[PDB]
Design a binder for this molecule. Structure first.
Ligand code: CL
Ligand code: MG
Ligand code: MG
Ligand code: MG
Ligand code: MG
Lengths: 244, 241, 231, 195, 243, 250, 226, 196, 204
């Protein structure tokens, strides 16, 4: 019958690895690099769009940076379509929590929920896993500014600075070198752009190949603002930091 | 090489099970033809009864789907009857839900959508049949719409199906290149049937007796099949000029 | 070979190998005999032990006051099928106040076994059954195969070395069919029949299992010292 | 059950609940505690239909304790009260609704403020300086409207509560066998054993 | 290759090999026939006597559906029983909704669609039987034969099993020598002869003949088994023709 | 019976490739060329009506389809897969939007719904991916005119102008030289016809070309008068004659 | 509520009053009771106002999808069949009483529909609390072979009878004309015979009349930058 | 309602009034209660108009699907389909239907299906609120094998009386004739039948 | 027993020249017993304002439900929902509970950010839309509000004049209803400024 055609997506190898998870991670390593850096006064999210065209409408385009709510955003590395499925689920979970407790969802609770959904696809159901790695940038009043990552296995970890996608080994070494604990957002903006500029597979880093976002308490008094940078604003910050 | 057993893509972006279903279509070794008149739509098909123990009256590949719609099938009879039963059920349900007779082109689309599903869902196999639906539609007039195992369908001025479809197709093409009109300019359906049989004789190069053919005719508000004696009268008129 | 992975696959010669493998489990099982006259029907079964400390596996199961069977093959499968027969005998008595005909019981067993030979995921039953009974048309003996094939017979045998007993019954056909109104002589004929299938071992007091049903005799099973009279 | 009262003062929330349990004709018990600790700084008192009251209270308690363990964090009184309201708002359109009214007294350790929430079985929530359920408010609110100040001490709150209970014992037809009084503040929950 | 390992898979020819393998099981079975007469139908089947211990006349093979339809089949006997059980359900629901007993052509399609459905999926196996069936309805007598593929047509005469070629030839002679038609009683006699003649393909073991019929004049359009004197008369007629 | 294929038929290979999606894209590459161009005051989508037989009436086969009054779609790849996607897209525009908000969805969100359907055929049990790439053009009040491409994976991207299918690589280069941000709709139609001529072998006229625009509101195509706020559909399919008129000024 | 439908030479006209009520209170004085199922199929509803509007939009939505699926302009008989089967299923609990009219490739049609699923055919129909007042006018002045101008006149006269004589009806007359081979013309407030007279007095208050405790600016803007 | 069906020499004729009622208000004075479920199988409806329209629509669907598979259904078969719906849904329906049809083998046949969902084959049948007043008249005046003209007169006179006494009945008398020759509709106005 | 008058309360909305106003009382009660004088019945999602009267548990539930839905709307649409669109969402949401409804009387008020056009709308408990040019009323003193609005209202009132008109409409209506009062709030809404004013009124 049908058993003949079953790939068995949720089995261990003789070495105790999950075949499909490992292969999904291999897919993600070819996606555009996304970087997250956490500072004392905010968080930076920087990401590289994959080899674009002059005829792509950039100002209405979004493939890397997504808003989950007013306090939490994600950077995507992998299959965009897979990511949007999970992103919509995460947006709903955040609203479910807000309706139930009348408080904005703590960052870790949202991250754990999405990660558990990824885990399920590796243990039961016989379906392929989601080929997506996330960087979560968020703020809540318990832990303040937070950075997390999750991958197709459903495992998640916290970070001061982190990269996903292509050239993570090179990117992580550069971040480990220049990152300091007392760093500020404006310094972190410069570090993120400098790291992408050195790790990119493109010839030069220009405004049309980037997506950029900051989460600042640089919002008038005790509150948090998300800023998804416009094409002209990415062009200006590239001149300011002296990359173009 | 399990991409050849179920309906998933091959490295060339092909669906082999669909392609092999097209081949099953010619297993009966029967050719069919359909044309449009001013007021009617005619469909003819070869009839072959190879066993003397068979009851020849039960051997048929033309189906009365509804009062207005007829369907001829190219392919094995089990799959043909499967499609026939479903088409009959769909036409009846349509009339119940929407209060008017299901149009020929709409039924064709519906059966084509069902066929498309078999090409995408793995547990279901394609049906090895090509379905030619005929009617005189109340809005569009004389109509021929044909469906295949890929889920493709389109309207026709005229059409042909079977092992020798190309010969019949080119013969019909040449006639419409002369006349420069989209139909047979004839008042009666009897003469449109005579046109259909004549041009099949020309294209295949074979003569027909009354038991070698099977004819279906669609007029305003009814589709019907001809008896052997009705076909005989048609054959006599062809021979007498 | 390439066509024995499941029950849903015919071989190029039109064989169903999973069903044939299930048939093989019966041949490994211990011998059991069935025979009947016009008044009575008898089951004789050679029980098999694991070793000298162990008990002898029971072979005969009662289905109703007028019906029962003996098994050869997978014992748990016999339990499933005999349970189904108990239910069907019971449905007939409760709903219709009617004792289930032995022939109809065979038809029901055939249809239950068939469904397991045409669907994916399942497997055939791995047991053969000899059903005896007395109903409104007299004594009956049936043979069930897990292929679905059920056959009505005067006498038969299934299991290992069953061919010896089957030939003896084929010779004695004219004699034992006439043993009317004499239960002891009909059992004697069955014990003599099953003896044609023994090698190295003989019929002892905890080895032999006998069952009988008839005109004025409810289905009863004899074990232990109750069969010493026939040894 | 019967009378449940609440008052929020400067630095604490005080909940008072009756001790009687009556099975129609007889008073089966005169020492019943109509409250459950949901978290170290959050207390819930309850009254309504027999059985449903304790079943609901313990169900809520189990859920908040589960949250506390999972996150290693105590939910704010506001968050707990919202969770409770949703459960009752869900319940009111069920096959058989929970017939339970609650008061939630909590001390918010983040804002350093006491908070009192009143929720009825429909899921009607209000934050109040003082509250009650059933007929309790009909007797006590005129006294609370007069004497209440937002800057009252815990001792002044207990005294105003005594005046309320005295009025209840005078004008109510039912003998509710006194009240158990509990205080919720920055240090947690404690019971006043002489009242 | 591998196209023949799974049901419902088209081969590069456009063939379903699993269905073709089911036909092999049919060809391995005993011979069964059907004859359409003037006002009805006759069915007959060869029953191999495997042993003396088989009770004569007891293991009945031909099956009735409703009260006016007879069914006989060659191949896997259990598969045939399963198909008849479905047929009995189909006939029951038809009569329940529409009152009239199911017409034979209507009944034919019900079996046809059900058998065809077992060629659509790999989770099921095709039927290992060819079924000859028919009876009398409001439009007269009808005889059908249904294959593992779901294919069926109407017949003047029909045969299947190991001795089908021999039987078919005998049936073809009857069609040619009787264009006006055959009587019901003649058809019973002829059916006995054809089974006896077809038994040459199974000559090792002796056999038992089993005949049934539905006739407007002889059985009032109901299905009945041929028994006693009429059966013996047919056996005598058959034995006389082989000698 | 029962669908016993509850497992994924699209899985990751050791190299991280999703084979079935790649093969679906290959099927799209074999498909007939279709394109889209965005102007300041409109959007144009176009393709070739590759007729399978001259006896076939190619007007009965619609490659350019109306999804909503202000949104249209064209494809390259497997026609039947496109047809069922158009049915599903038309329905989801109502069920998940119009029956909730009382208005038609904006282009980007309808695209998002179609993308979701295509993503699920890439992960769900017992199914293959859709063998088509879609180009969806539309207008809405707050986003203005827009053009989107949707692939078998479910991924979608916004374009100023683009092409998919057979001769897409050459067509995209042709569009890069001609496109600017000051184009009027008539200029974009002219460029569309010039671009499409390169990938067409045989006849090139109004009967072999299918072309539609998202432009001004057409009150003449509304079917009723009396409601000032209802001004008619922005989607309009050009006639055979209208195409031929612009082929003389070519 | 008063709603009517009248057949004429080359089409059909429907009309309705513009009063919606909650018990004895007028909720809206200029209500729109003429609903569009499709461009040339319109219906008017009486009974539970949410039901008539919901059932119209559901069937209208499904009719639009059907029209796109079949590549044909929608038919009135389709709208009728879909409405009646939906309403029968809900056994009258969906309180929608409708007059359905329109033109399609088959011709011009006029039907009405009771909440429990029953339909009828006619040349002139009326529904609602003012249906008896309207039907009295229709039975007095209807003839075969009415012109467009005569049918509009008859329809609005029938609504006026409801307006003036039925307390459940009032205010203005809305009309929709559906002629064969033409666009359907929706004539909102075709008649306006109930304008309120000028009041005797202005009730504009001096500024500062109302006592105020607290004033504050409400932040409707999103969280700001910098 | 006043409805009836009568078999005669050449086939069967159905008759009905045209009055539909919600209380004392005549919601429709020109109703068509003679309903076609197949070419030569029609029915007369009485009871809830919603219920009888729903049932008749479903039967028409069932017989249309029957015809596509098995050819023209008998009148007995049509009656059985009506019965199945009326019997199995007896708790939720208020419907009294008379089924009339013409075969060539069976000629004219009449089946009546009252409230319970039972079936009764009869030479003629009467139903509806107005039928109570003409049991006496119809029993005295019905003969088997009447001519077409005699049967039209019998129905015209019978329904005339039913309309005269039953307030729920009225308007025009509609009739449908079912014979080998085809299907003929007849209508008779008040000025005609009131003077009988 | 009647769910729509257990808790009490009122809402009123009006249009003016380039502005809208929406106002409500502050009472929550358990029939005769006054429970809270701070129960506000007007909520806002972006620049769209929603007032809700009726059963208080449903008022709270629906506010939470529309906050939920408008938040997801904004994330997907990348813009704030407009009054016309939100009105349809309220109608849809109420009708889905046709045979088990929320016992409420919602009122929408706001200015379309693109056209600048003032907008108001009202609903019954099951979703029917009332889109009046002048004013909308809701609650246990809706009769009283209809009487005040019908005489006091005139078109094209300036923001500061409209404040006086709507305030006097609410106050005098509430004083003739036992289950309304205990405070009041008035929102004056212009295209890019909204002022909120608490009114001084009798506390019985
Ligand atoms: Cl479809
Ligand atoms: Mg498939
Ligand atoms: Mg009267
Ligand atoms: Mg008051
Ligand atoms: Mg008071």
């Amino acid at each position: 019958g049908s058993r003949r055609y079953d790939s068995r997506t949720t089995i261990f190898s003789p070495e105790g690895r999950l075949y499909q998870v490992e292969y999904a991670l291999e897919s993600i390593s070819h996606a555009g690099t996304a970087i997250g850096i956490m500072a004392s006064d905010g968080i930076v999210l920087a990401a590289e769009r994959k080899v674009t065209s002059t005829l792509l409408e950039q100002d209405t385009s979004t493939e890397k940076l997504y808003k989950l709510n007013d306090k939490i955003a994600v950077a995507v590395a992998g299959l965009t379509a897979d990511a949007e499925i999970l992103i919509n689920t995460a947006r709903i979970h955040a609203q479910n929590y807000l309706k139930t407790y009348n408080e904005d969802i703590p960052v870790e609770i949202l991250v754990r929920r999405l990660s558990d959904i990824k885990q399920g696809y590796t243990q039961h159901g016989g379906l392929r896993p989601f080929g997506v790695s996330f960087i979560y940038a968020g703020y809540d009043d318990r832990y303040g500014y937070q950075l997390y990552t999750s991958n197709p296995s459903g495992n998640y970890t916290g970070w001061k600075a982190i990269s996903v996608g292509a050239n993570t080994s090179a990117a992580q070494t550069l971040l480990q070198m220049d990152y300091k604990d007392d760093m500020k957002v404006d310094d972190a903006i410069e570090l993120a752009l400098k790291t992408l500029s050195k790790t990119t597979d493109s010839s030069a880093l220009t405004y049309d190949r980037l997506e950029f976002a900051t989460i600042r308490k640089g919002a008038n008094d005790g509150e948090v603002y998300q800023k998804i940078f416009k094409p002209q604003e990415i062009k200006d910050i590239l001149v300011k930091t002296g990359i173009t | 090489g399990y991409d050849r057993h179920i309906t998933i893509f091959s490295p060339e972006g092909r669906l082999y099970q669909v392609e092999y279903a097209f081949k099953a279509t010619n297993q009966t070794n029967i050719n069919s033809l359909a044309v449009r008149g001013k007021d009617c739509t005619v469909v003819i098909s070869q009839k072959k009864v190879p066993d003397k123990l068979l009851d020849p009256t039960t051997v048929s590949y033309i189906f009365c789907i509804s009062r207005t719609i007829g369907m001829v099938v190219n392919g094995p009879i089990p799959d043909a009857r499967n499609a026939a039963l479903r088409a009959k059920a769909e036409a009846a349900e349509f009339r119940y839900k929407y209060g008017y007779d299901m149009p020929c082109d709409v039924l064709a689309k519906r059966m084509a959508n069902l066929s498309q599903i078999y090409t995408q869902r793995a547990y279901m196999r394609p049906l090895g049949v090509i379905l030619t639906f005929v009617s005189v539609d109340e809005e569009l007039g004389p109509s021929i719409y044909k469906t295949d195992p890929a889920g493709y369908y389109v309207g026709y001025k005229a059409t042909a199906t079977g092992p020798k479809q190309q010969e019949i197709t080119t013969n019909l093409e040449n006639h419409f290149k002369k006349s420069k009109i989209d139909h047979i300019n004839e008042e009666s359906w009897e003469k449109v049937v005579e046109f259909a049989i004549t041009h099949m004789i020309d294209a295949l190069g074979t003569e027909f007796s009354k038991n070698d053919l099977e004819v279906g005719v669609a007029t305003k508000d009814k589709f019907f099949t001809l008896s052997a004696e009705n076909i005989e009268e048609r054959l006599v008129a062809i021979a007498e000029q | 070979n390439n066509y024995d992975g499941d029950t849903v696959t015919f071989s190029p010669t039109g064989r169903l190998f999973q069903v044939e493998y299930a048939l093989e489990a019966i041949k490994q099982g211990s011998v059991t005999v069935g025979l009947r006259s016009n008044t009575h029907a008898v089951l004789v079964a050679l029980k098999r032990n694991a070793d000298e400390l162990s008990s002898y596996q029971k072979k005969i199961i009662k289905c109703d006051e007028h019906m029962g069977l003996s098994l050869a093959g997978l014992a748990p499968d016999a339990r499933v099928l005999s349970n189904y027969l108990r239910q069907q005998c019971n449905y007939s008595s409760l709903v219709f106040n009617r004792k289930l005909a032995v022939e109809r019981a065979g038809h029901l067993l055939c249809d239950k076994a068939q469904k397991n030979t045409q669907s994916y995921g399942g497997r055939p039953y791995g047991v053969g059954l000899l059903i005896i009974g007395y109903d409104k048309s007299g004594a009956h003996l049936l043979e069930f195969q897990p292929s679905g094939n059920v056959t009505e017979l005067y006498g038969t045998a299934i299991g290992a070395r069953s061919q010896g007993a089957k030939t003896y019954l084929e010779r004695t056909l004219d004699t034992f069919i006439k043993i009317d109104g004499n239960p002891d002589e009909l059992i004697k004929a069955g014990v003599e029949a099953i003896s044609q299938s023994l090698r190295d071992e003989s019929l002892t007091v905890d080895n032999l299992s006998i069952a009988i049903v008839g005109k004025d005799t409810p289905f009863t099973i004899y074990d232990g010292e109750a069969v010493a009279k026939y040894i | 059950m019967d009378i449940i009262l609440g008052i929020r003062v400067q630095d604490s929330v005080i909940l008072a609940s009756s001790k009687a349990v009556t099975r129609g004709i007889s008073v089966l018990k005169d020492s019943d505690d109509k409250t459950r600790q949901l978290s170290p700084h959050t207390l819930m008192s309850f009254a309504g239909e027999a059985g449903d009251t304790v079943q609901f209270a313990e169900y809520i308690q189990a859920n908040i304790q589960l949250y506390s363990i999972r996150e290693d964090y105590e939910l704010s009184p506001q968050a707990v009260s919202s969770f409770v309201r949703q459960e009752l708002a869900k319940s009111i359109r069920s096959r058989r609704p929970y017939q339970v009214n609650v008061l939630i007294g909590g001390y918010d350790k983040k804002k350093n403020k006491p908070e009192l929430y009143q929720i009825d079985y429909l899921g009607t929530k209000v934050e109040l300086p003082y509250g009650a359920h059933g007929y309790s408010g009909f007797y006590t609110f005129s006294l609370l409207d007069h004497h209440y100040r937002p800057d009252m001490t815990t001792e002044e709150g207990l005294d105003l509560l005594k005046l309320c209970v005295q009025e209840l014992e005078k004008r109510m037809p039912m003998d509710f066998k006194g009240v158990i009084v509990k205080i919720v503040d920055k240090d947690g929950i404690r019971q006043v054993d002489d009242f | 290759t591998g196209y023949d390992l799974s049901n419902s898979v088209f081969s590069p020819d456009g063939r379903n090999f699993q269905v073709e393998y089911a036909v092999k099981a049919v060809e391995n079975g005993t011979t069964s026939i059907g004859i359409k007469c003037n006002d009805g139908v006759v069915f007959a089947v060869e029953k191999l006597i495997t042993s003396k211990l088989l009770v004569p006349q007891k293991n009945v093979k031909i099956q009735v559906v409703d009260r006016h339809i007879g069914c006989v089949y060659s191949g896997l006997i259990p598969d045939g029983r399963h198909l008849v059980n479905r047929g009995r359900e189909e006939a029951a629901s038809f009569k329940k909704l529409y009152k009239t007993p199911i017409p034979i052509p209507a009944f034919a399609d019900r079996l046809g669609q059900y058998v065809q459905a077992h060629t659509l999926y790999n989770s099921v196996r095709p039927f290992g039987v060819s079924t000859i069936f028919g009876g009398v309805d409001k439009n007269g007598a009808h005889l059908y034969m249904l294959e593992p593929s779901g294919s069926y047509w109407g017949y003047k005469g029909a045969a299947t099993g190991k001795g089908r070629q021999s039987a078919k030839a005998e049936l073809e002679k009857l069609v040619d020598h009787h264009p006006e038609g055959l009587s019901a009683r003649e058809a019973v006699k002829q059916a006995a002869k054809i089974i006896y003649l077809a038994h040459e393909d199974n000559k090792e073991k002796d056999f038992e003949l089993e005949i049934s019929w539905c006739s407007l004049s002889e059985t009032n359009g109901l299905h009945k088994f041929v028994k006693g004197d009429l059966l013996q008369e047919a056996i005598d007629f058959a034995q006389k023709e082989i000698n | 019976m029962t669908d016993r294929y509850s497992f994924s038929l699209t899985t990751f290979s050791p190299s991280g490739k999703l084979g079935q999606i790649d093969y679906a894209l290959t099927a799209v590459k074999q498909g007939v060329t279709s394109l889209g161009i965005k102007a300041t005051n409109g959007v144009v989508i176009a393709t070739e009506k590759k007729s399978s037989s001259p006896l076939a009436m190619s007007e009965t086969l619609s490659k350019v389809s109306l999804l909503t009054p202000d949104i249209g779609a064209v494809y390259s790849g497997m026609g039947p897969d496109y047809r069922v996607l158009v049915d599903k897209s038309r329905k989801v525009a109502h069920t998940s939007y119009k029956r909730i908000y009382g208005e038609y969805p904006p282009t980007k969100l309808l695209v998002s719904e179609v993308a979701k359907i295509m993503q699920e055929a890439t992960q769900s049990g017992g199914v293959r991916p859709f063998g088509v790439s879609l180009l969806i053009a539309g207008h809405d009040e707050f986003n203005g005119f827009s053009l989107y491409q949707v692939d078998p994976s479910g991924s979608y991207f916004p374009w100023k102008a683009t092409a998919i299918g057979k001769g897409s690589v050459a067509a995209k280069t042709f569009l890069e030289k001609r496109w600017n941000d000051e184009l009027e709709l008539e200029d974009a139609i002219h460029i569309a016809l010039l671009t499409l001529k390169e990938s067409v072998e045989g006849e090139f006229n109004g009967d072999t070309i299918e072309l539609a625009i998202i432009g001004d509101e057409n009150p003449d195509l509304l079917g009723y008068t009396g409601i000032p706020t209802d001004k008619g559909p922005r989607f309009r399919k050009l006639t055979s004659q209208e195409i031929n008129d612009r082929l003389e000024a070519l | 509520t008063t709603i009517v439908g009248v057949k004429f030479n080359n089409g059909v006209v429907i009309a309705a009053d513009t009063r919606s009520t909650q018990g004895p209170i007028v909720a809206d004085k200029n209500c729109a009771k003429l609903h569009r199922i499709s461009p040339k199929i319109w219906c008017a509803g009486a009974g539970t106002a949410a039901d008539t509007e919901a059932v119209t939009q559901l069937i209208g939505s499904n009719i639009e999808l059907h029209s796109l699926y079949t590549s044909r302009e929608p038919r009135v008989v389709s709208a009728l069949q879909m409405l009646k089967q939906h309403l029968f299923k809900y056994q009258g609990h969906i309180g929608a009483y409708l007059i359905v009219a329109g033109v399609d490739p088959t011709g011009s049609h006029l039907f009405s529909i009771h909440a429990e699923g029953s339909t009828d055919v006619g040349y002139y129909l009326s529904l609602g609390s003012g249906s008896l007042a309207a039907m009295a006018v229709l039975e007095s002045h209807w003839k075969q072979d009415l012109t467009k101008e005569e049918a509009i006149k008859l329809a609005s006269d029938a609504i006026q009878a409801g307006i003036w004589n039925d307390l459940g009806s009032g205010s203005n007359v809305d009309v929709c004309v559906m002629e064969i081979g033409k666009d359907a013309e929706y004539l909102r407030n075709y008649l306006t015979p109930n304008v309120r007279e000028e009041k005797q007095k202005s009730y504009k208050f001096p500024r500062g009349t109302t006592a105020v405790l607290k004033e504050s600016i409400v932040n409707i803007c999103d969280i700001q930058e910098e | 309602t006043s409805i009836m069906a009568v078999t005669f020499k050449d086939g069967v004729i159905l008759g009905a009034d045209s009055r539909t009622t919600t209380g004392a208000y005549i919601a429709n004075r020109v109703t068509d209660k003679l309903t076609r479920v197949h070419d030569k199988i029609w029915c007369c409806r009485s009871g809830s108009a919603a219920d009888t329209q729903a049932i008749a629509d479903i039967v028409q669907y069932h017989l249309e699907l029957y015809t596509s598979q098995y050819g023209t259904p008998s009148t007995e078969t049509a009656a059985s389909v009506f019965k199945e719906l009326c019997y199995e849904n007896k708790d939720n329906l208020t419907a009294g239907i008379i089924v009339a049809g013409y075969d060539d083998k069976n000629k004219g046949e009449v089946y009546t299906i009252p409230l319970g969902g039972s079936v009764h084959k009869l030479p003629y049948a009467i139903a509806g609120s107005g039928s109570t007043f003409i049991y006496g008249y119809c029993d005295k005046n019905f003969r088997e094998n009447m001519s077409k003209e005699e049967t039209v007169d019998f129905i015209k006179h019978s329904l005339s009386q039913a309309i005269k006494w039953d307030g729920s009945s009225g308007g025009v008398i509609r009739m449908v004739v079912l014979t080998a020759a085809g299907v003929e509709r007849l209508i008779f106005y008040p000025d005609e039948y009131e003077q009988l | 027993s009647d769910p729509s008058s257990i808790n009490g309360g009122i809402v009123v909305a009006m249009t003016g020249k380039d502005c809208v106003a929406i106002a409500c009382d502050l009472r929550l009660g358990s029939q005769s017993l006054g429970v809270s004088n701070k129960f506000e019945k007007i909520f806002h999602y972006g620049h769209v304002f929603l007032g809700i009267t009726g059963l208080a548990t449903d008022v709270t539930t629906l506010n939470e439900m529309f906050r939920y839905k408008t938040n997801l709307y904004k994330l997907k649409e990348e813009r704030a929902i407009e009054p016309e669109t939100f009105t349809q969402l309220v109608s849809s949401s109420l009708y889905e509970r046709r045979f088990g409804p929320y016992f409420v009387g919602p009122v929408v008020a706001g200015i379309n950010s693109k056209s600048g056009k003032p907008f108001i709308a009202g609903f019954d408990l099951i979703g029917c839309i009332d889109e009046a040019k002048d004013f909308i009323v809701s609650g246990t003193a809706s009769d009283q509000l209809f009487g005040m609005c019908e005489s006091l209202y005139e078109p094209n009132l300036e923001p500061e004049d409209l404040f006086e008109t709507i305030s006097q409409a609410l106050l005098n209506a509430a004083d003739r209803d036992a289950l309304s009062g205990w405070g009041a709030v008035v929102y004056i809404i212009k295209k890019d400024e909204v002022v909120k004013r608490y009114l001084k009124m009798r506390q019985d």
